[PDB]
Design an enzyme around this catalytic site. Sequence first.
Site, PDB file in Angstrom:
ATOM      1  N   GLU B  43       0.800  -1.226  -0.002  1.00 33.56           N
ATOM      2  CA  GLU B  43      -0.122  -0.088   0.050  1.00 33.56           C
ATOM      3  C   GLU B  43       0.763   1.231  -0.132  1.00 33.56           C
ATOM      4  O   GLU B  43       1.916   1.388   0.681  1.00 33.56           O
ATOM      5  CB  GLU B  43      -0.879  -0.087   1.199  1.00 33.56           C
ATOM      6  CG  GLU B  43      -1.731   1.216   1.407  1.00 33.56           C
ATOM      7  CD  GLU B  43      -2.570   0.970   2.678  1.00 33.56           C
ATOM      8  OE1 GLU B  43      -2.263  -0.102   3.422  1.00 33.56           O
ATOM      9  OE2 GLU B  43      -3.665   1.723   2.937  1.00 33.56           O
ATOM     10  N   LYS B 110      -9.151   2.892  -2.635  1.00 35.38           N
ATOM     11  CA  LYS B 110      -9.680   2.129  -1.391  1.00 35.38           C
ATOM     12  C   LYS B 110     -11.012   2.653  -0.879  1.00 35.38           C
ATOM     13  O   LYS B 110     -11.222   3.866  -1.019  1.00 35.38           O
ATOM     14  CB  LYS B 110      -8.458   2.604  -0.355  1.00 35.38           C
ATOM     15  CG  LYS B 110      -8.494   1.622   0.994  1.00 35.38           C
ATOM     16  CD  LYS B 110      -7.404   2.155   1.931  1.00 35.38           C
ATOM     17  CE  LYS B 110      -7.277   1.399   3.224  1.00 35.38           C
ATOM     18  NZ  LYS B 110      -5.972   1.772   3.966  1.00 35.38           N
ATOM     19  N   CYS B 146      -5.571  -3.064   1.754  1.00 40.03           N
ATOM     20  CA  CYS B 146      -5.401  -3.337   2.947  1.00 40.03           C
ATOM     21  C   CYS B 146      -7.023  -3.683   3.771  1.00 40.03           C
ATOM     22  O   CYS B 146      -7.321  -4.628   3.786  1.00 40.03           O
ATOM     23  CB  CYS B 146      -4.723  -2.111   3.947  1.00 40.03           C
ATOM     24  SG  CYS B 146      -3.980  -2.424   5.421  1.00 40.03           S
TER      25      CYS B 146
HETATM   26 CL   LIG Z   1      -4.379  -4.370   9.265  1.00 41.41          CL
END
Ligand SMILES: [Cl-]
Lengths: 526, 526
Positions: B43, B110, B146
């Site tokens: 990320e 995201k 994530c």
């Molecule tokens: Cl995490």
Amino acid sequence: MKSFKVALAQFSPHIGNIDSNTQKMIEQANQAKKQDADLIIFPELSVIGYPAEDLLLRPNLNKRMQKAFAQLSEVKDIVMVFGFVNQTEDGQRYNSAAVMKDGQVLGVFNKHNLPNYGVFDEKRYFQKGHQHLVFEYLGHKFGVLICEDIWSINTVKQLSQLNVDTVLVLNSSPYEVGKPQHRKQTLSELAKQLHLNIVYVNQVGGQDDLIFDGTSFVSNQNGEIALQAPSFKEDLYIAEFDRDTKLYKVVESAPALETFAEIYQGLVMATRDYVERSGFPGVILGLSGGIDSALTLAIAVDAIGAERVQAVMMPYTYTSQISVEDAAEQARRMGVTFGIAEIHSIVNSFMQTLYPFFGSPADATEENLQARARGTLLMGLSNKFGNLVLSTGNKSELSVGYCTLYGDMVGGFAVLKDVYKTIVFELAKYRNSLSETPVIPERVITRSLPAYDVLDAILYAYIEEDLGQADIIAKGFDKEVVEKVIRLVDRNEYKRRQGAIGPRITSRAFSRERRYPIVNGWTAND
Amino acid sequence: KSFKVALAQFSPHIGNIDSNTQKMIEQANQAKKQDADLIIFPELSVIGYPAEDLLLRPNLNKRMQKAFAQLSEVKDIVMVFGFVNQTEDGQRYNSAAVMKDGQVLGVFNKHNLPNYGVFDEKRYFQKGHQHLVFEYLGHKFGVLICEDIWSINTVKQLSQLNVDTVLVLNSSPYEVGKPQHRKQTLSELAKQLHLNIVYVNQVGGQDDLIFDGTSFVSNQNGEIALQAPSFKEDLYIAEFDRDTKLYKVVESAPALETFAEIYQGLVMATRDYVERSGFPGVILGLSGGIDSALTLAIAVDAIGAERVQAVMMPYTYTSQISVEDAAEQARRMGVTFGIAEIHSIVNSFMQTLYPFFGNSPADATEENLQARARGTLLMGLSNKFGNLVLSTGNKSELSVGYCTLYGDMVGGFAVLKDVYKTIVFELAKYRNSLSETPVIPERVITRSLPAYDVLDAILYAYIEEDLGQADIIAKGFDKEVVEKVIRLVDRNEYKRRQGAIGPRITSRAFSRERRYPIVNGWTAND
Ligand SMILES: [Cl-]
Ligand SMILES: Nc1ncnc2c1ncn2[C@@H]1O[C@H](COP(=O)(O)OP(=O)(O)O)[C@@H](O)[C@H]1O
Ligand SMILES: Nc1ncnc2c1ncn2[C@@H]1O[C@H](COP(=O)(O)OP(=O)(O)O)[C@@H](O)[C@H]1O
Ligand SMILES: [Cl-]
């Protein structure tokens, strides 16, 4: 459309002390009634205060909000508008305002615009509202908004489209130079644009690193300000709506403070509040003969009175006699206890001890020892007799690191940490202008716990598991021991802040992950 | 058709987009040499995690553009990497780019922005709503970031699009037990949703956080195909078998035991803070107690005994056993060892304090002086020769305030600050089990700037106005002066963190309002 009176409660909360805030709200509601007020409006989140930080995440929070509503339901004969944390059946939490009269919740508003920039972290805690609250009382249509909402053109235009007469705004708006009057200029022009009155109530008082200036006001729908509360004062202000003119009666106020007068009063208030809320008997600071400590001395004396201020001059070899006289004279003029503690013997002992390691040209190291000797001396007096040490570093020094770790950075409160040196001079000049004889000499301005296995289990339960006291005891631990441990944890938040960073390995590190106030009033019991 | 996927277990230099981009390019070329068809980075790999308020800098988007231009030169491999996506409206997303031969095939924004615990992503980003699925060599890849993989609804959406493999970019911080827990949870999710999961995680210490890496590939049957070790920076290759529709299972060593994993994380974090801050070595007080003995071993494992210094600083009641155990560990580990008695220093403090103390009875005050003498001595050596001071306080002590401000809290990095005393014992036992001769004696385990008007104008430009150096220079200030001031501001972030709280009066206070990393690699120009 009947005439009425609005009480603006410029209110200072004890962050996290729901029992205390609720009691004061009731006391202020009683006082407003005695003054014939028909409504009383409190600051944002007034039941718990701002910033309550990760207290807003405690599982037992909703039950305490419910108890608070139960207590507030006993107040009769006045409409109350106050801040609380609204938790819904699904578990969502909102930053909310309640309108209550005679134990009936007339309406609830959930804040639409959650600031998550700068000093604000509200999306750590709340979900945003979508609906508006308008209620009619005595022929008057009231809308309700919370802080950041009044600054979102879209949100306010929506409320305007409902043809509101007066918008009640609850705020925890922190202070910065120029903001108190800037708020009035902007919301006055906005009130004029939308043909509505704005009742703007703001929290007041110092809280940890923040100042809340209060400076509540009422702006009429023609754009004229009707009522102006002073900055940095806790009080109840009454505005009067005239049925005939459809305006609030204009109440004469003093001129706005000059810039440096405003900063100065803010620093005095912040210093007093940190001293009082931590329960310190007084303050102590090193007096160098320089302007930073001379200014901090005046602010401390203005905050809590000369009888609670102590000053120490700590000369070394290169300390001018002029420096000692200026420090002594200001202490004398202000009525402050003053002592002289020479450091040459302490410094020499350090140098003798360091000599076999140094062998090395002299440099900052030797001068840093002097700063650290002073800091340790002040902390010796602080440890022994309990005065809070006021550090005197300013924003220019802290910006570029022209300060010594564990030396002149020593202290529990740094009055000038956000004040540039340029502003320090201006504040010193201002403070001297208040007295026939300058207080700052004018030349200064022109130069027994359980064993670790039990202890760590209780800490893991309180920290990592964020359990309340009753739940930790239910694991099988003794009640007085759990109470003592929790007390020690909360009391040492201030100390943890000054320690070095270190690597997280747990589910709840003290730094970054766990965000609790220093001045913390959360009562232990459920 | 069969293909190979490269998992880049990558350690970014936070804020150093130039360096991160060059290393990404090197890893992609290395992955090509190993016949990889795709390479997946962590990320925000271009800027790193946590970059904090660097993510708000106005010139960020231009630096992202240069990075994309540099990455566009890499040919013949699909790259999937993290970047900050800024759109025409100016909104910013936490995003992943899929790039091949200088063409952006897709961008994913995201969906789930963590704003809890150690995460503040709603300070920086707006959330995405769309999914990115791309087909490469007959295989359908979905892309998630994530927190997205832990949101069942978000992942179920990708399942509804008949993805074959989900690529996940992560900056997932370490906590004990999490490396293995991630594998168990996401392998079961892979089995539930009949898709493979490629989980790439950042690695390395950064400020207060540890990133463990422990990247892996889980097959759609729930079996783990590839397992990267914790705390290592490397490139791992997984191979998809066209016939079986699974990634080939690659043998790995057993998972680390609990305390072995913690220990390695602390060594890595200590090494990274030391090296990235550019320290020649470290120094610490050796008390003969287990905390400093453990910290010494971690320091030695981190950077080698030749860069570690230990000082024993006895006072009157310092046992001879304590001095021998400290000396013996130093000798066993090959660490330079010195003894600095503090009797004379403490006696000088007492003589100076005597007329203030009078006949007040002795208490913690007197013992605190000893701790403070030691801390000042260590900072004397640090100031003169440049070693980072490692503080040895543990989490149990910091919880209940059983430490001394400016004494044993002295240090620039606190290796054990998130380690309970209970865990300290287990880590020492673990470390001793690694060698025929215990390193920790078993006895220990069982006991010239411009004037202020110019300077303050430049600081106001850099801080309150958050201007880059070129824009400050364009105000009429000298280039080298602005560059020096900005360097000094950034270099003293670590120092400001350890100072006392103080009241905000400006639009940009150093504490709470301005959030910058300590280990900061943001290049000065454009
Ligand atoms: Cl995490
Ligand atoms: N990046 C850093 N992280 C942690 N500690 C640091 C860092 N840089 C410097 N230090 C510590 O800070 C000291 C410098 O600050 P200080 O002791 O206040 O003296 P000075 O007046 O010379 O700035 C160094 O000797 C070192 O111990
Ligand atoms: N609420 C607080 N805010 C700021 N400083 C505080 C606060 N409470 C205590 N202090 C300071 O911390 C000191 C206590 O810590 P310390 O010097 O490490 O000694 P001890 O080890 O005996 O606790 C007090 O003497 C006081 O100067
Ligand atoms: Cl505000």
